[PDB]
């Protein structure tokens, strides 16, 4: 046609489309592509006027409580209509933390957190979870998931240990299969470091947080990782190469420092290593107010934050609120020659490369036929499989000569289900579920451990629930056995940092009351190893269930012997927090349970 514009031609090669569009852009259009804002500060005028490149939902940033998939699609499409109305019509990309399913959304399947996935040693399971997650994210109109976290947690006092598959880099490397699940498999020909997304039923992925987020002193979140280059490259870096080989579209930078250098200011690692050595050609995104946190106190020199980060090689800044100040400062740095146009053009080349590659110019709007993928039963069946595979049986009898307690019989006259975590969907999902920090009670659609027991047992079995029964209640109750579930409360990021790793009361006291009256199976809900000798001493059987998500029937599938226990510890279980850090090759390696430990059962 006479009004032909090459970048708008879907038959043209991505690199030609990128260069064609880049060549038309003004500095304001270029800096707008580099800007990611919260939906909370977005309006149609803001998105058009500042040529915004991306939006996100932070944890709990939702159009309303209980919103349907269509409500999400209508919100995202509203923002997109504004972006498509700009002079160049560059669609925005919408990101979200879909880190164990599409976890901010009511009715989304919630998969086990990464630590329990590590326990499965099943990369294909994790790929299938990426596939199901992409469908439930696209059900809501969202095109970009901030996952996987390929942190290698080296100290369980870290609040984000549950977001790491393992302390063993080799397990983390294996679980990079989430990437082709979320994005699609890369073709035969594929060049390591290029971005890839198969099309409108897949999402852009994000390898995070580059690099050494799991290596910080005493597990302090966002703090310093003190390790020589050989150890950074041997432990923290390897899974990023697997991510490049699988075509991960984006990389998010860590709040943490390496030997005192902020990652958000580290040109040698972000440009010298990730871009120039690993040949990454997708886009690099900040963390949330990550450039503000380059300084002490955070946000005390935002002009320096902007200069340091953009010169380090970051492409897109998760501002996410003060966009006027970000755009203004960056524009002033370019106008002043402090940041060269070559750097702006690289950042925009990478952002557009991802957008064109993933088909976002061809399919900028949501597909209403995808809405019904949210919470689909096949995905729940997958989450139930994953939860069951994640369980690690730590004890199954007090002595070598006792009858094994597990598997339990489905037919018994009366059984007890007890503990703070037995009937609390929010607790079994943990952080990053509906709210940022997670929450308590019936926050979404799912099955608690109590509901799963009631669904599993013979009709003649009477199930009694008591959250915190006393010893006499148990001894007088006529119970065959008890299932008692206790553990950690939900947490995220620095709220989770914990130097004592002792579960909250009344958990141990409830286990001791229950188990002292009747044979008991203790189900421990945690993001990590926690002080466990007292729980073990009380219990006939004890299962580390991690944070198994919405499908509590995965727990009962192994308790009642439909399947055998197969999970193995993906991290060391410490005897004492004074040991830490303590990893599977140090001089003082003296675990309660070594990495890889796990008892088994046979299906009944
Ligand atoms: C209400 O959330 C908080 O908003 C203020 C400013 O209005 C920010 O400065 C805070 O950092 C966030 S806290 C928390 O941050 C998460 C990322 O670390 C994000 O995913 C979540 O939405 C926020 O609640
Ligand atoms: C580590 O945390 C300490 C104590 O909160 C803080 O003062 C220091 O700046 C932090 N270091 C880094 C690199 O973040
Ligand atoms: C353990 O640490 C957490 C916070 O890090 C705290 O809330 C809890 O009370 C501590 N428990 C004990 C017994 O010190
Ligand atoms: C479970 O299966 C294997 C046989 O393949 C056996 O060696 C193991 O001891 C069995 N344990 C049981 C049935 O309790």
């Amino acid at each position: 046609a006479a009004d032909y514009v090459l970048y708008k031609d879907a038959t043209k090669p991505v690199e030609d489309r990128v260069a064609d569009l880049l060549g038309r852009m003004t500095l304001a259009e270029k800096i707008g592509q580099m800007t990611q804002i919260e939906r909370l500060v977005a309006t149609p005028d803001v998105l058009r006027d500042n040529f915004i490149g991306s939006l996100l939902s932070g944890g709990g940033s939702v159009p309303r409580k209980g919103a349907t998939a269509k409500e999400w699609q209508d919100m995202v499409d509203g923002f997109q209509k504004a972006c498509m109305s700009t002079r160049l019509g560059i669609p925005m990309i919408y990101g979200i933390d879909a880190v164990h399913g599409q976890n901010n959304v009511y009715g989304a399947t919630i998969f086990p957190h990464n630590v329990g996935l590590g326990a499965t040693r099943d990369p294909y399971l994790v790929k299938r979870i990426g596939e199901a997650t992409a469908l439930e994210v696209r059900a809501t109109g969202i095109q970009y998931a901030f996952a996987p976290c390929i942190a290698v947690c080296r100290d369980p006092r870290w609040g984000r240990c549950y977001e790491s598959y393992s302390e063993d880099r080799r397990i983390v490397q294996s679980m990079t299969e989430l990437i082709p699940g979320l994005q699609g498999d890369v073709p035969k020909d594929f060049t390591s470091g290029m971005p890839f997304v198969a099309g409108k039923n897949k999402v852009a992925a994000c390898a995070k947080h580059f690099v050494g987020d799991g290596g910080t002193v005493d597990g302090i979140n966002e703090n310093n990782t003190i390790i020589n280059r050989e150890g950074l490259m041997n432990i923290h870096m390897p899974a990023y190469k697997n991510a490049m080989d699988k075509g991960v579209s984006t990389v998010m930078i860590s709040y943490s420092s390496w030997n005192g250098v902020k990652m958000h200011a580290n040109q040698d690692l972000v440009t010298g290593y990730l871009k120039d050595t690993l040949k990454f050609k997708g886009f690099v995104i900040s963390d949330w107010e990550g450039i503000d946190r380059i300084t002490t106190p955070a946000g005390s020199d935002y002009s320096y934050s902007v200069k340091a980060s953009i010169l380090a090689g970051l492409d897109m800044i998760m501002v996410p609120n003060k966009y006027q100040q970000f755009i203004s400062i960056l524009t002033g740095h370019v106008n002043g020659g402090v940041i060269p146009m070559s750097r702006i053009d690289d950042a925009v080349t990478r952002i557009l490369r991802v957008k064109f590659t993933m088909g976002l110019f061809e399919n900028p709007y949501a597909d209403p036929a995808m809405a019904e993928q949210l919470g689909k039963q096949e995905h729940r069946d997958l989450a139930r499989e994953a939860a069951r595979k994640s369980l690690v049986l730590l004890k199954n009898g007090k002595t070598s000569t006792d009858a094994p307690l597990l598997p339990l019989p489905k037919k018994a006259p009366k059984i007890l289900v007890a503990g703070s975590h037995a009937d609390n969907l929010g607790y079994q999902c943990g952080g990053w579920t509906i709210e940022w920090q997670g929450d308590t009670g019936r926050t979404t659609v799912g099955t608690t451990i109590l509901e799963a027991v009631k669904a599993a047992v013979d009709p003649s079995t009477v199930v009694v629930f008591a959250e915190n029964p006393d010893a006499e209640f148990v001894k007088s109750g006529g119970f065959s056995y008890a299932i008692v579930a206790v553990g950690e409360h939900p947490y995220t990021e620095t709220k989770g940092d914990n130097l004592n790793l002792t579960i909250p009361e009344p958990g141990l006291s409830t286990v001791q009351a229950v188990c002292g009256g009747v044979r008991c199976a203790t189900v421990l809900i945690s993001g990590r190893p926690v002080v466990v000798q007292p729980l073990l001493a009380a219990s006939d059987a004890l299962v580390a269930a991690w944070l198994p998500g919405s499908e509590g029937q995965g727990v009962t599938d192994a308790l009642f012997g439909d399947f055998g226990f197969t999970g193995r510890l993906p991290r060391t279980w410490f005897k004492s927090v004074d040991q830490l850090p303590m990893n599977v090759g140090d001089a003082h390696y003296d675990p309660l349970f070594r990495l890889g430990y796990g008892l088994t059962t046979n299906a009944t």
Side-chain angles (χ1 to χ4, degrees):
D3 62 350
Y4 179 79
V5 167
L6 191 152
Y7 76 83
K8 293 179 175 175
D9 183 345
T11 71
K12 290 285 181 157
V14 167
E15 292 306 303
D16 294 346
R17 298 177 75 185
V18 172
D20 181 76
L21 175 50
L22 185 69
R24 303 172 186 259
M25 295 171 75
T26 69
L27 178 58
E29 283 162 345
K30 288 180 183 176
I31 288 172
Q33 285 298 302
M34 298 173 69
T35 307
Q36 183 185 75
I37 73 175
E38 242 284 348
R39 52 158 292 269
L40 289 163
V41 299
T43 68
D45 285 338
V46 168
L47 294 173
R48 281 170 208 119
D49 295 351
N50 301 284
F51 303 104
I52 296 298
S54 182
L55 283 87
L56 84 160
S57 278
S61 183
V62 303
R64 61 181 193 143
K65 283 324 281 249
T68 63
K70 171 182 176 343
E71 283 177 69
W72 282 91
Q73 289 195 181
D74 291 339
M75 180 192 65
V76 174
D77 282 344
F79 296 141
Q80 188 70 289
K81 185 77 182 294
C83 294
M84 291 306 289
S85 81
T86 62
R87 182 179 85 103
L88 296 177
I90 303 170
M92 62 84 213
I93 189 177
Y94 196 112
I96 199 166
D97 294 288
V99 298
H100 67 145
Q102 176 51 146
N103 51 73
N104 283 119
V105 173
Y106 182 85
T109 307
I110 303 300
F111 293 91
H113 275 300
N114 284 182
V115 59
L117 301 182
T120 75
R121 299 300 202 277
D122 193 338
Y124 182 50
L125 173 73
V126 172
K127 184 182 183 179
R128 288 185 282 141
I129 291 174
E131 296 178 339
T133 299
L135 291 172
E136 300 205 18
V137 175
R138 285 286 196 164
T140 65
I142 293 174
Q143 313 98 344
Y144 176 27
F146 302 132
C149 183
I150 59 165
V152 182
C153 177
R154 295 298 285 179
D155 193 322
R157 290 177 293 179
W158 193 34
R160 315 193 74 167
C161 205
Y162 67 84
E163 297 194 67
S164 169
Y165 297 110
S166 183
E167 73 194 32
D168 187 344
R169 67 92 182 170
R170 295 181 167 98
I171 294 170
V172 174
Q173 281 183 101
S174 73
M175 306 299 191
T176 64
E177 284 297 282
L178 191 80
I179 293 164
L182 286 166
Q183 296 191 327
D185 289 310
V186 304
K188 285 109 286 103
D189 49 76
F190 189 70
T191 300
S192 177
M194 288 289 284
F196 183 77
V197 182
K200 66 183 189 183
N201 300 118
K202 295 291 191 182
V203 299
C206 181
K208 71 188 192 179
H209 314 87
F210 181 87
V211 57
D213 44 347
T216 64
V217 178
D218 291 342
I220 297 163
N221 188 221
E222 310 189 10
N223 206 255
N224 199 8
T225 294
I226 301 165
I227 197 164
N228 68 8
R229 190 182 194 85
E230 165 177 330
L232 188 81
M233 299 293 178
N234 190 52
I235 293 168
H236 290 110
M237 188 65 75
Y240 284 89
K241 166 83 146 63
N242 301 76
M244 302 295 100
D245 287 354
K246 295 176 192 187
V248 76
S249 290
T250 75
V251 172
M252 183 180 298
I253 304 305
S254 190
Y255 291 125
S256 60
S257 299
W258 181 41
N259 294 327
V261 177
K262 289 282 183 182
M263 283 305 321
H264 283 248
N266 198 319
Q267 190 185 274
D268 285 354
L269 283 180
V270 174
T271 299
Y273 199 76
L274 175 65
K275 290 179 171 191
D276 293 353
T277 306
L278 295 184
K279 302 305 175 178
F280 182 55
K281 299 298 191 194
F283 71 77
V284 179
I285 188 170
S286 82
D287 211 334
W288 172 286
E289 307 170 336
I291 75 170
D292 308 51
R293 297 181 197 176
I294 287 165
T295 65
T296 288
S300 76
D301 194 339
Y302 196 69
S303 173
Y304 176 69
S305 282
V306 174
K307 167 172 137 171
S309 64
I310 298 306
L311 290 182
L314 279 72
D315 304 313
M316 180 181 292
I317 301 309
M318 186 184 300
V319 177
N321 299 312
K322 298 181 180 321
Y323 59 79
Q324 185 186 314
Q325 172 190 53
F326 172 73
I327 290 170
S328 183
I329 288 179
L330 178 54
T331 299
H333 283 151
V334 175
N335 283 343
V338 166
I339 294 166
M341 189 64 22
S342 58
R343 183 70 273 285
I344 300 301
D345 284 354
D346 172 62
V348 175
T349 289
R350 291 164 173 279
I351 296 165
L352 294 181
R353 179 181 293 124
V354 172
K355 294 187 170 186
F356 283 113
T357 294
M358 76 191 287
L360 189 62
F361 287 71
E362 279 63 73
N363 287 281
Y365 298 110
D367 184 354
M370 291 295 281
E372 68 165 36
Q373 298 281 338
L374 196 72
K376 234 180 27 182
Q377 191 62 28
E378 295 87 339
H379 296 349
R380 294 191 189 273
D381 295 344
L382 172 68
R384 174 176 178 176
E385 173 185 359
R388 176 251 300 178
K389 287 173 166 184
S390 74
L391 306 176
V392 182
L393 182 64
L394 293 179
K395 184 179 178 170
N396 191 193
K398 293 201 186 164
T399 82
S400 82
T401 63
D402 284 7
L405 178 62
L406 305 179
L408 296 164
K410 295 177 183 182
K411 193 180 172 172
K414 189 178 178 189
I415 67 172
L416 178 61
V417 175
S420 54
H421 291 58
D423 194 36
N424 191 320
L425 185 65
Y427 284 7
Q428 80 184 50
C429 291
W432 291 117
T433 313
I434 303 300
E435 298 290 356
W436 175 44
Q437 289 296 318
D439 198 1
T440 181
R442 187 180 308 160
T443 58
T444 190
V445 176
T447 299
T448 67
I449 289 171
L450 174 62
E451 292 166 344
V453 167
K454 293 179 176 181
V457 293
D458 186 274
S460 69
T461 303
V462 174
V463 178
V464 175
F465 175 64
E467 188 171 330
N468 288 299
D470 68 21
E472 176 190 338
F473 176 96
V474 182
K475 281 181 232 104
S476 291
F479 299 117
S480 291
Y481 55 83
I483 297 164
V484 58
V486 301
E488 297 193 298
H489 293 173
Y491 56 78
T492 306
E493 294 179 76
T494 304
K495 290 275 178 172
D497 290 355
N498 185 334
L499 295 180
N500 63 75
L501 297 181
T502 291
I503 66 166
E505 303 155 74
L508 177 57
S509 55
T510 295
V511 166
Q512 289 170 335
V514 171
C515 301
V518 74
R519 280 190 95 204
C520 70
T522 297
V523 176
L524 176 60
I525 300 285
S526 71
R528 48 181 163 204
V530 292
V531 172
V532 78
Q533 297 98 317
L535 287 166
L536 285 170
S539 300
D540 298 89
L542 190 147
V543 173
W546 313 106
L547 301 172
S550 58
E551 303 317 310
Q553 294 166 99
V555 174
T556 50
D557 284 347
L559 292 175
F560 295 112
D562 287 345
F563 298 85
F565 285 92
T566 54
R568 292 188 295 262
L569 289 185
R571 45 202 311 112
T572 296
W573 210 297
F574 56 82
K575 291 177 171 177
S576 172
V577 294
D578 300 335
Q579 301 174 301
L580 299 175
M582 185 176 70
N583 282 294
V584 69
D586 313 357
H588 72 290
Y589 199 63
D590 181 24
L592 190 67
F593 300 107
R594 75 189 168 273
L595 185 134
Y597 179 87
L599 305 180
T600 65
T601 60
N602 297 332
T604 34

